[PDB]
Amino acid sequence: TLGRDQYVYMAKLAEQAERYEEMVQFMEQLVTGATPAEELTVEERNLLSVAYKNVIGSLRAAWRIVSSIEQKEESRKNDEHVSLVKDYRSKVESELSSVCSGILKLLDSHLIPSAGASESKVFYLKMKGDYHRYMAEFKSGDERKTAAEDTMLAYKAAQDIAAADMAPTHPIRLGLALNFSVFYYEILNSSDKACNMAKQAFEEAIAELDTLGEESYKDSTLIMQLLRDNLTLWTSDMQEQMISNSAP
Amino acid sequence: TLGRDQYVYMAKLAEQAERYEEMVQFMEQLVTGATPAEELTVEERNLLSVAYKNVIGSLRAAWRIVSSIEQKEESRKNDEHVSLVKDYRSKVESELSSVCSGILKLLDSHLIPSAGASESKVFYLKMKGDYHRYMAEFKSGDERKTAAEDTMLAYKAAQDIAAADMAPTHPIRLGLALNFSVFYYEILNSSDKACNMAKQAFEEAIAELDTLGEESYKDSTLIMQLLRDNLTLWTSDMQERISNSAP
């Protein structure tokens, strides 16, 4: 076993080598060894989030490609290749599930219990909704509806806490509104609800934009632009009743 | 167990998804089931080469980064951080060793025996030397010399066959001379021999490049352009980067 400061060094070392599967292991060991008794630092909090974002991001990108090839093979009526491709996609899906379960388990057992402030709660609850949403991207029915309900619970909990204590210009609250609006748009097909949410968070940040500090102005404004980009792509598109840019 | 044609489809599928560790496995099983009784098709032979190239390239890239991190830490005399980085580098080295052994074992047990033509023999022998050279990159001391010796034998064997049966404009023979010259410059620090070897291959090829058509002109000239890129880098290096190996 290494020290807390040493796992941060090993996580960064793995980050430089783009060996993210091991960056996750180094941060998990840091988490399980310092929480829930104590709270993660902003640095450790972001290193963990970055580690899982890259690991799952790589599998999400692969799943898109495989799923796309499957549709291309089913349009050819190539029954042979369709059988092989679906075997492969399920292998990627089991790995997507493995990673989401890892962080979701760490969120319930360690991270959320460790949050002793609204900022940390909203961060981990948002994160909890994020990886439930990733589960909902490849699940079919029932499993997807369950994945969607778990997403709704985690996000709406983070939204309640954030709106009451977080500032509308805080990147975490902004990122929450972004990913939450992506949830309505891409998981629930509610363009109207998703646009109304993104716009509200955007305008709320504009009103208090003067009181935005050096530390988080780029993080905030970046999310603000992603909200505006999505809102343009969504309003440019046209739904009927009821990829998008998620947070950094 | 799947069929030969299907392993090709799965290897191609893994390549599209950029899941190269699996692309290797699909081809490994294709090889162990089809050879040495028969020989790999050019397609299969290339799918195998690409799969291992990406896997070992990814680790070689990480090893350069980690190895670079270690040096800086030592320059500051952190001591603690230094011991941590080496333990991490040694983990990447064990993986590099695992990959190379995988293809090297596949070469000596299945692929080289299957080669019933000089072109294939030189392709598989040139590959054997490539992955012994990758061992020599991170090995040190006693283990390094053994790796450098194994590289010399694979390349020299491929060169003997190539110079006798392959044309000096053939991309495989040009790539061999390219990687074989990089071996002398990077591993053995023989700046002169690496240059003499590169120039010879580039001279022997241009002397026959006129009679070469536009079908493989891009193939030959591309490796030729790499032979001179290294040869320009090396000359400037003697005016006191990583050499361009073959595609």
Residue numbers in the entry:
A (entry chain A): 4 to 245, 1170 to 1175
B (entry chain B): 4 to 243, 1169 to 1175
Q: What does the literature reporting this entry say, word for word?
A:
Many phosphoproteins of the BR signaling pathway, including BRI1, SERKs, BKI1 and BZR1/BES1 can associate with 14-3-3 proteins. In this study, we use quantitative ligand binding assays to define the minimal 14-3-3 binding sites in the N-terminal lobe of the BRI1 kinase domain, in BKI1, and in BZR1 from Arabidopsis thaliana. 14-3-3λ and 14-3-3 ω isoform complex crystal structures reveal that BKI1 and BZR1 bind as canonical type II 14-3-3 linear motifs.
We obtained poorly diffracting crystals for a variety of combinations, and refined structures of 14-3-3λ—pBZR1169−175 and 14-3-3 ω—pBZR1169−184 to 2.8 and 3.5 Å resolution, respectively. Both 14-3-3λ and 14-3-3 ω form the canonical 14-3-3 homodimer in the different crystal forms. Dimers within the same asymmetric unit are highly similar, but the ω isoform dimer adopts a more closed conformation when compared to 14-3-3λ, even when bound to the same peptide ligand. In contrast, the entire pBZR1169−175 (RISNpSAP) is well defined in the ligand binding site of 14-3-3 ω, with the N-terminal Arg169–Ile170 peptide adopting a different conformation in the 14-3-3λ—pBZR1169−175 complex. Asn233 forms hydrogen bonds with the backbone of both peptides. Mutation of Asn233 to Ala in 14-3-3λ had little effect on pBKI1267−272 binding in ITC assays, but reduced pBZR1169−175 and pBRI1869−874 interaction by ∼5-fold and ∼2-fold, respectively (compare Figs. 1, 2). The mutant protein had no tendency to aggregate and behaved as a stable homodimer in solution, suggesting that the mutations do not interfere with protein folding or homodimer formation. Together, our mutational analysis of 14-3-3λ highlights specific binding of the pBRI1869−874, pBKI1267−272 and pBZR1169−175 linear motifs to 14-3-3s from Arabidopsis and validates our pBKI1 and pBZR1 crystal complex structures.
